[PDB]
């Protein structure tokens, strides 16, 4: 039961788990700026491999990276995709992942935005849609 | 149950009543809430007023269905669950549905039960309870004059310009458009849909040198033709000319050879010819409609059944895929979304193949 | 998994039918409810309109396949499943194989458990998978005129000589694949089906050997015409040919058998029967082009249908795919990209089945 997202995070952990010339551009794009708490780290261990220049490969990459990392890499090579990437498949991902971030800007403000609903408000209470519905009008 | 998708779209918009509210009535809502919801929905455009869920704020708190809808949290969660902002008519319309059920129960199990009860009267119960039920833009043409009292041909048209077997539909797509290939870099992918290429490359060229009426089918040419067809010989099969022939399959030759070239060549026109033997019509006139949509260019496609809308109007969508339709009688024209009510004339010679113009 | 992230697109594009209903249709899908989603998905947009979830959630709620299918439990979950609306292609062209999977499992697990039943009627068994399972540049034209006029032949041409009847056609093989065998070693084949292929046999010794007048087709001649003997098979039998009239044939044997005959021939053209008997006359000529690509030869099949191109249409379809066609009245090649197209026919003399070029 994996939602909307999480995949397009994949989109990168399997994306240069099998080409690091299509994972040079996410120091640029995703340095990150990450979304999962244990996807930042595998990121600081993918780059740091690009320096001493050795056979890199779906499997050979994934044991530097010790234990934990694997039942979770490995389950991220068991995968079903291919090498042919486009350039808006490239600019796609962009969105994505730093973004989902935003859609998380309407929950912990809801919280406060819900709570001027228990006190009757809806003089100003009824102005942070604004400030949301065509907030993601962007 | 549409009415859940059907009432919190009205913010999004937020003027989403412009066709909501010049539809249906808050009645057909079951509800006490959507319905009183939708009647002080219903006194905003007194002026008016205009649009925004505050103005229902002070509105539904105001004659008091604030305790009386589903509270606070049923309010924004109409907001929080309607997407598709692009429907609203729509949409609306299965509720009524839901109400075309309502249409019907208290009007016939009024009558199912007056066996027990008009009795008695009958020729009153009978004329009654039936009486119920008594409700430029604008890429181009060659003769600029035609980019213009219409204004293109531009991304995202079904630009069909029909006519009987062999008067215009067959070949008005050798005319226009290479002046948009040839003339200007707005590249192509055709398919030659009444005959094979071959002859359809032997259709096109007769306009340039004015050549082929002695003729090329039977013989060859004359002398200062020959120098006056090397004066016409470079601009097909040199040009970014790409046509398609294959025979009968449903769409599909289209797409497998036009999806590859969308980075190569550029795609600005997308062409196709006769309709009636590609082997109802609608499953074939759609696979056209969200592919201006995925590809974004001006398209051209000549059907068949006068021409009006109302001959091609049930042998092919024609009205709906494509709200431009022009003809082939001059040029007829019947419904145009894009530019002005000027019409045009250019004369047709039916030999060397030529709309000359006025 | 291929099919457990499809439908998106279908609400990100969401006119994301057209690549759907592309290369596909809304049978393939096996899990009880995408193909019924997807035959929701096209008259839901067969309108209109063109696509939303919602549009989607109509249909089904009132096909009430969505207490049938399940309900809304599955618009969140695949309205979020798609990570990238881009796949698309894809994906409908690597999910084929999988309902492709059973495409000949169907047709074959059939006559496995059938053969519990032909016994009986046996060999009938085999054309149910035959619609079931199965689903001088140059080596010489004809003429030095005609071979100084289109040129070939060349590499990977299908061609049709629409022959007429009561003039003749007989003379026309014995003057395009008579001399070609006997000169160089670029050697060819024969089709005779109809007729049995040893009849033909009086045809081009007697046009060899120029000896049929006293005559060779019945028996012992007068002491004489024992003379111009050693002419007709004194040159037909240092090549290489393999004459035919195997039965009423489809085109798959000349796959398969063109297979192993350009690995068991030598190989300059592959002369085949006149287009209307192999079968049902339109289909023939379609793979008859590929087949000029295969064995690395051009590859004849002429025609019993004024004569012109549109006879061999009273009885085929040929446009599309051959495209040279010549005739007989008069060779009328008027068809080709080469560049030389003629209006020639030649003098007879039919005592010895002669043709005549100046």
């Known amino acids: ?138 | 149950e549409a009415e859940q998708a059907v009432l919190g779209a009205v913010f999004l918009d937020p003027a989403a009543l412009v066709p909501a509210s010049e539809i249906l009535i808050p009645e057909d809502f079951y509800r006490a809430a959507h319905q009183k919801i939708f009647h002080a929905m219903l006194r905003v455009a007194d002026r008016g007023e205009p649009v925004d869920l505050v103005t229902v704020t002070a509105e539904l708190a105001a004659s008091e269905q604030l305790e009386e809808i589903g509270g606070v949290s049923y309010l924004s969660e109409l907001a929080d669950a309607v997407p598709t902002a692009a429907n609203v008519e729509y949409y609306a319309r299965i509720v009524e549905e839901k109400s075309v059920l309502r249409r019907l129960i208290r009007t016939a199990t009024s009558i199912a039960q007056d066996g027990y009860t008009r009795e008695d009267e009958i020729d009153v119960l009978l004329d009654e309870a039936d009486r119920k039920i008594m409700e430029i833009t604008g890429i181009p043409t060659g003769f600029t004059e035609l980019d213009r009292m219409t204004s293109g041909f531009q991304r995202s048209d079904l630009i069909i310009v029909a006519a009987r077997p062999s008067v215009g539909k067959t070949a008005f797509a050798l005319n226009i458009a290479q002046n948009v290939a040839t003339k200007t870099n707005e590249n192509v992918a055709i398919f030659s849909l009444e005959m094979s290429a071959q002859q359809l490359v032997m259709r096109m060229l007769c306009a340039e040198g004015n050549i082929n009426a002695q003729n090329l089918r039977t013989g060859k040419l004359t002398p200062e033709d020959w120098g006056k067809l090397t004066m016409a010989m470079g601009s097909l099969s040199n040009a970014g000319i790409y046509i398609d022939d294959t025979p009968s399959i449903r769409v599909s030759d289209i797409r497998a050879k036009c999806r590859r070239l969308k980075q190569e060549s550029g795609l600005g026109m997308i062409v196709i010819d006769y309709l009636q033997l590609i082997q109802e019509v609608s499953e074939i006139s759609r696979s056209l409609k969200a592919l201006a949509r995925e590809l974004e260019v001006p398209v051209i496609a000549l059907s068949q059944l006068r021409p009006m809308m109302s001959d091609i109007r049930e042998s092919g969508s024609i009205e709906q895929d494509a709200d431009i339709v022009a003809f082939l009688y001059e040029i007829i024209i019947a419904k145009q979304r894009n530019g002005p009510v000027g019409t045009v004339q250019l004369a047709f010679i039916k030999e060397y193949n030529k709309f000359v113009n006025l």
């Open chain 1, 1 to 138: 039961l994996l939602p909307a997202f999480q995949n397009a995070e994949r989109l990168l952990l399997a994306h240069m788990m099998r080409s690091r010339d299509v994972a040079l551009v996410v120091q640029e794009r995703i340095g990150g700026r990450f979304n999962i708490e244990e996807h930042r780290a595998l990121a600081a261990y993918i780059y740091a491999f690009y320096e001493e220049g050795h056979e890199a490969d779906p499997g050979a990459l994934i044991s530097r990276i010790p234990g934990e990392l694997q039942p979770l890499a490995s389950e991220l090579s068991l995968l079903l995709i291919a090498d042919d990437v486009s350039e808006q498949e490239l600019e796609d991902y962009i969105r994505h992942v730093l973004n989902r971030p935003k859609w998380l800007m309407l929950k912990v403000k809801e919280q406060e935005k819900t709570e001027a609903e228990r006190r009757k408000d809806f003089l100003t209470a009824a102005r942070i849609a604004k400030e949301m519905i065509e907030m993601k009008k962007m």
